[PDB]
């Protein structure tokens, strides 16, 4: 049925520094339009499973 | 940069084994996955196996027990051989890459496919004829002329003008399947009428399934 | 070795937005999020659009967006531009270690114009005549509503033998073009003083007429 | 190697502030002096200040209390702003370098200037028309054709042929100031008459003050 | 914020030599020797010639020489070649920390030929006619002595309304070219069966005549 408890981050502003860690969960903003914490086109949740 | 390109014939009757290759242009073998994708006329896509490069595989159990893929890494080829075809596999055949490493997945650069018909009635060469303009065929400063291609079993014939010289006002009409079972089509170009007495044009029909390659000049009428 | 699910053609006006769906079982699209979309122009090779429910690869407009709810993904286009009339397929990574493709969906941008038919006529070629053949050729293009009917005629008469016709098909300017073929014996071509081609399209009837020499 | 190039518009009415820049091509900022030089129509030159690069200045007291020069060393710009113009400053404006280090002095590589008119009657787009040749317009093996441009307030319009294709027999006549106050001019080319039926030509008017850019084909007469 | 001093046009025959003067106060040219010369071709950008009363920068002919006596400098050209017809300016480093330019001097090489006028005529363009306009265009070039006068004519009549004329101006081959414009209503262009352009130049009168279609 699928083990959906193992997630990974697929969007970030900039690549990590070595051994750096980032557990935030802010709505990513692809396009120029601001997101205001809601999903939509060019406003994506940053974690997939 | 990297592009694909199909190969191989198709016209064989029913119940045999066909072959195809997808020689790689830009050069990227040995790193990705490479798969073959069918598509019948007017219907949705499909899928068949792939082959890593070092190891290998095959897939789509519905087509299993019929298909074999092989890879020649030296000259960068995929062979695909289906066996005992059934004239229900009369389709276009793309050879898209695949993608790993950077997850992505799905697919990627494709390869223009190859119409592969499966039936009797072996290939026929087309007959070419010119379509000259006239005083009625001009529209003042503009005028149109063309070329008729007739009676060929290939089906996927192609047409150029003056070795691909002109891209303005050129139109190729879709082929009509005549009651005889042979196809025939037409190509046309419209251009400023003034250049009619000074300039020359040749329409160049290429028929890959046969070996027909005919280039015919068009001329004003007497 | 089965298939997915998708609706047939959809509709929409320019500048608006539209959303096309792609529904599958919860063992391919529910239990995965490796879905990707593909756009294919008529008679072309499909083009890669976005991997992972959403992630336009560097090179695609930002009017496209992907999303999922549960074993059902969807693609949204914004500000419908009248060059996106194409077919759209979705794919995923079904279990059993295999991929699967949708069923396709023809996008209709709800074109504005009612372009009238550009018609032309072509008489037999000389080599064809000497080849013991004749074939009148009627060509049409640049008419928007692809619902024309063509009527072959002797010098003016309705004639119903040797007429072949294609169904209209879309151009690159989103317009339509078609052709009609009238096969005749050379004695038939030297037989009539004229011939005519009639194109009926939205009431409007345009006609061409030719004559041997 | 190093070249200069002006910028900036000019057509504003009287009593305002204009601007200009002289972006440097070959790349030599931060080492020399850079100054701006006026020239009215048909009269002698003049001079305005300069700006070292690190420090700065301004000069020509006759024009003092009106002019300000600035420099952006990053993207290599000189701004020059005169204020409250008077329609007596209707001139071409060069931006020549200067020279130090090796004494020399005087000036050096200049920059093609920029006609800057000062008055009312805001810009107007030109109307383009073709001038076809004829049997009377040919001289046996040679023949001439042209293009008329009419009724524009820009004044400094420019004209090319087939994207600058031809440089033989091309002549652009000086503009005439019509009683209306609008200018209109003509361009012409003479060429071996034989190529008249086979070849094509387009005259390309560029009007920088408006944004008019019109390219029109010339054709033989019917 | 004043000015220097220079003579107007000078004259000279080829192969000879000529000297052009530049006189200023003894607080700019007397009290300095930073003078430099500049050559400008008609409708071009001036060209740097020699810094410090004399010192042709690598790239200039050696037919030029500069010199000074006292608050008066001068430039000498040798073997006048008939491509040096231009304007010549001198500059210096006046006190008060500023520069100054001369007044310019038109060099005349005393041309040899008496080139006759090449004339051409152009009738209205069709788009202009449909645009409710007409403009006959008379062009002249390749005549040396720039003293032509143009006379506009109805089918042969002297006509004096709607005539505009430029003054001759120098070509690159040192010859001259001019134009004349005759504005007319379309009824005027359809009105006369012909029109004519007369160019008088050194007694010689050349005429062109056209006709609507
Ligand atoms: C792959 O998995 C699918 C199920 O997701 C298998 O499909 C069939 O399942 C449907 C019900 O969902 C039945 O109605 C069919 O009769 C089943 N067919 C078969 C052949 O099992 C499919 O078979 C699997 N294929 C492989 C190679 O494992
Ligand atoms: C720069 O010096 C000049 C003199 O060389 C000044 O000019 C004037 O001198 C003349 C006589 O030679 C007088 O007739 C003018 O009335 C003077 N005008 C002025 C404004 O003084 C000039 O003024 C000086 N300028 C600066 C900025 O010092």
Task: Say if CB E129 and CB E189 are below 8 A apart.
Answer: yes
Residue nearest to atom 23 of ligand 2 (CA): E1
Q: Which residues on chain C are in Cβ contact (under 8 Å) with B59?
A: 97-98
Question: CA–CA separation, C98 vs C95, rounded Å?
Answer: 6
**What's chain D's Rg over C-alpha atoms?**
21
What is the DSSP-derived secondary structure letter of residue C127?
H
Task: Say if CB C22 and CB C102 are below 8 A apart.
Answer: yes
Question: CA–CA separation, D57 vs D49, rounded Å?
Answer: 7
Task: Say if CB B63 and CB B48 are below 8 A apart.
Answer: yes
Name the β-bridge partners of B82.
B18, B67
Q: Which residues contact C102 (CB under 8 A, 6 or more apart)?
A: B44, C4, C5, C6, C22, C89, C90, C91
**What's chain A's Rg over C-alpha atoms?**
13
Long-range contact pairs involving B19-22 (C-beta distance under 8 Å, separation at least 24): B19/B79, B19/B80, B19/B81, B20/B78, B20/B79, B20/B80, B20/B93, B20/B95, B20/B114, B20/B116, B21/B77, B21/B78, B21/B79, B21/B80, B22/B77, B22/B78, B22/B80, B22/B95, B22/B111
Nearest CA in chain B to C209: B136
Q: Is some CB atom of chain E closer than 8 A to the CB atom of D162?
A: no
Identify the burial level of D217 via C-beta atoms within 10 angstroms of its C-beta, where 0-12 means exposed, 13-18 middle and 19 or more buried: exposed
DSSP collapsed to 3 states, C132-201: CCEEEEEEEEEECCCCCEEEEEECCCECCCCEEECCCEECCCCCEEEEEEEEECHHHHHHCCCEEEEEEE
- Phi/psi for D113 (5° steps) reads 65, -175
**How close is the Cα of E44 to the center of ligand 1, in Å?**
83
Task: Return left, alpha or beta for B106; rule: phi > 0 is left, psi -120 to 50 is alpha, else beta.
Answer: left
- Phi/psi for B91 (5° steps) reads -150, 175
Q: Residue B142 is inside which H or E element, if any?
A: strand B142-152
CA D46 vs. chain centroid, Å, equals 19
Task: Return left, alpha or beta for A2; rule: phi > 0 is left, psi -120 to 50 is alpha, else beta.
Answer: left
Question: CA–CA separation, B73 vs B27, rounded Å?
Answer: 11
CA E35 vs. chain centroid, Å, equals 27
Name the β-bridge partners of E64.
E77
Task: Say if CB B79 and CB B20 are below 8 A apart.
Answer: yes
Residue whose entry in the numeric block shows the structure tokens 């020549």: D96
CB contact residues (below 8 A), chain D span 164-183, against chain E = 171, 173-176, 178-179
Residue nearest to atom 16 of ligand 2 (CA): E2
How do the residues of chain E divide into helix, strand and coil, expressed in percent and rounded to 5? 5, 45, 50
What chains are in contact with E, requiring at least 3 Cβ pairs below 8 Å? D
| SS3 state of residue D189 | strand
User: What's the token pair of residue E27?
Assistant: 């607080």
What chains are in contact with A, requiring at least 3 Cβ pairs below 8 Å? C
Question: CA–CA separation, D73 vs D56, rounded Å?
Answer: 12
Could you name the CATH architecture of D127-218?
Sandwich (2.60)
Characterize the bridge pairing of strands B142-152 and B170-172.
unpaired
Q: Is some CB atom of chain C closer than 8 A to the CB atom of B129?
A: yes
Where would I find the H helices in chain E? 126-130, 186-191
The CATH superfamily of B16-116 is Immunoglobulins (2.60.40.10)
Question: CA–CA separation, B93 vs B3, rounded Å?
Answer: 16
Q: Which of B5, D105, D5, D192 is nearest to E92 (CA)?
A: D105
Q: Would you call E45 and D130 a contact, using CB atoms and an 8 Å cutoff?
A: no
Q: Residue C129 is inside which H or E element, if any?
A: helix C126-130
Distance from CA of D142 to the nearest CA of E (A): 13
Task: Say if CB E115 and CB E143 are below 8 A apart.
Answer: yes
Nearest CA in chain B to C42: B42
Taking the alpha carbons of C49, C55, C61, C65 in that order, is the dihedral positive or negative?
positive
Q: Which structural technique was applied?
A: cryo-EM
Which of C94, C96, C100 has most ligand 1 atoms within 8 Å of CB, for mutation? C96
**Chain B interface, mutation test: which of C34, C122, C123, C171, most B Cβ atoms within 10 Å?**
C122
Beta carbon of E97 within 6 Å of any ligand 2 atom: no
Characterize the bridge pairing of strands E107-108 and E10-11.
parallel
Residue nearest to atom 27 of ligand 2 (CA): D61
Q: Would you call C62 and A48 a contact, using CB atoms and an 8 Å cutoff?
A: no
Q: Which residues contact B206 (CB under 8 A, 6 or more apart)?
A: B157, B158, B159, B160, B212, B213
Q: Which of E184, E104, E181 is nearest to E140 (CA)?
A: E181
Q: Which of E174, E94, E189 is nearest to E137 (CA)?
A: E189
User: What's the token pair of residue C205?
Assistant: 């009837």
Task: Say if CB E172 and CB E179 are below 8 A apart.
Answer: no
Residue whose entry in the numeric block shows the structure tokens 């410090």: E52
The angstrom resolution of this structure is: 3.0
Task: Say if CB B79 and CB B69 are below 8 A apart.
Answer: yes
Task: Work out the number of other CB atoms within 10 angstroms of the CB of residue D212.
Answer: 19
Q: Which of B40, B193, B200 is nearest to B116 (CA)?
A: B40
Q: Is some CB atom of chain D closer than 8 A to the CB atom of E173?
A: no
CB contact residues (below 8 A), chain E span 106-165, against chain D = 120, 122, 125, 127-128, 131, 135, 137, 139, 141, 164-165
Task: Say if CB D193 and CB D139 are below 8 A apart.
Answer: yes
| SS3 state of residue E189 | helix
Let me know if the fold of D16-116 is the same as that of D127-218: yes
**Chain A interface, mutation test: which of C17, C56, C65, C74, most A Cβ atoms within 10 Å?**
C65
Where would I find the H helices in D112-163? none
CA D116 vs. chain centroid, Å, equals 9
Residue whose entry in the numeric block shows the structure tokens 């194109």: C199
Beta carbon of B61 within 6 Å of any ligand 1 atom: yes
**Chain A interface, mutation test: which of C32, C36, C53, C54, most A Cβ atoms within 10 Å?**
C54
Provide the residue ranges of all domains of chain B, joining segments of one domain with +.
16-116, 127-218
For B174, the closest of C3, C127, C169 (CB atoms) is C169
């Amino acid at each position: 049925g699928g083990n959906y408890n193992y997630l990974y981050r697929l969007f970030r502003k900039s690549n990590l520094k070595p051994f750096e860690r980032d557990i935030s969960t802010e709505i990513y903003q692809a396009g120029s339009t601001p997101c205001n914490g809601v999903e939509g086109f060019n406003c994506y949740f940053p974690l997939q499973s | 940069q990297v592009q694909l390109q199909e190969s191989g014939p198709g016209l064989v009757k029913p119940s045999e084994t066909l072959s195809l290759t997808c020689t790689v242009s830009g050069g990227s073998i040995s790193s990705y996955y490479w798969s073959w994708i069918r598509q019948p006329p007017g219907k949705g896509l499909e899928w068949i196996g792939y082959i890593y490069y070092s190891g290998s595989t095959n897939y789509n159990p519905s087509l299993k027990s019929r298909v074999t893929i092989s890879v020649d890494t030296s000259k960068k080829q995929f062979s695909l051989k289906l066996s005992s075809v059934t004239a229900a596999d009369t389709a276009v055949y793309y050879c898209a890459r695949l993608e790993r490493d950077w997850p992505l997945d799905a697919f990627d650069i494709w390869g223009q496919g190859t119409m592969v018909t499966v039936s009797s009635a072996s290939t026929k060469g087309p007959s070419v004829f010119p379509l000259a303009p006239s005083s009625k065929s001009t529209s003042g400063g503009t005028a149109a002329l063309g070329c008729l291609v007739k009676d060929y079993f290939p089906e996927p014939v192609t047409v150029s003008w003056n070795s691909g010289a002109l891209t303005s006002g050129v139109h190729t009409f879709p082929a009509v399947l005549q009651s005889s079972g042979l196809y025939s089509l037409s190509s046309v170009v419209t251009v400023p009428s003034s250049s009619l007495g000074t300039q020359t044009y040749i329409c160049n029909v290429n028929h890959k399934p046969s070996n027909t390659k005919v280039d015919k000049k068009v001329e004003p009428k007497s | 070795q089965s298939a997915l699910t998708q609706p047939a053609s959809v509709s929409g006006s320019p500048g608006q937005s539209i959303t096309i769906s792609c529904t599958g079982t919860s063992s391919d699209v529910g239990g995965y999020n490796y879905v990707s979309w593909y756009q294919q122009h008529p008679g072309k090779a499909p083009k890669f659009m976005i991997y992972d429910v959403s992630k336009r690869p560097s090179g695609v407009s930002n009017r496209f967006s992907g999303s999922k709810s549960g074993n059902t993904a969807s693609l949204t286009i914004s500000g419908l531009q009248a060059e996106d009339e194409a077919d759209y397929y979705c794919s995923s990574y079904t279990s059993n270690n295999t991929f699967a493709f949708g069923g396709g969906t023809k996008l209709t941008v709800l074109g504005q114009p009612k372009a009238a038919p550009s018609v032309t006529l072509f008489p037999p070629s000389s080599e064809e005549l000497q080849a013991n053949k004749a074939t009148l050729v009627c060509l049409i293009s640049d008419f928007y509503p692809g619902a024309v009917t063509v009527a072959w005629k002797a010098d003016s008469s309705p004639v119903k033998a040797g007429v072949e016709t294609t169904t209209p098909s879309k151009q690159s300017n989103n317009k339509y073009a078609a052709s009609s073929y009238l096969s005749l014996t050379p004695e038939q071509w030297k037989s009539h003083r004229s011939y005519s081609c009639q194109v009926t399209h939205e009431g409007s009837t345009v006609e061409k007429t030719v004559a041997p020499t």
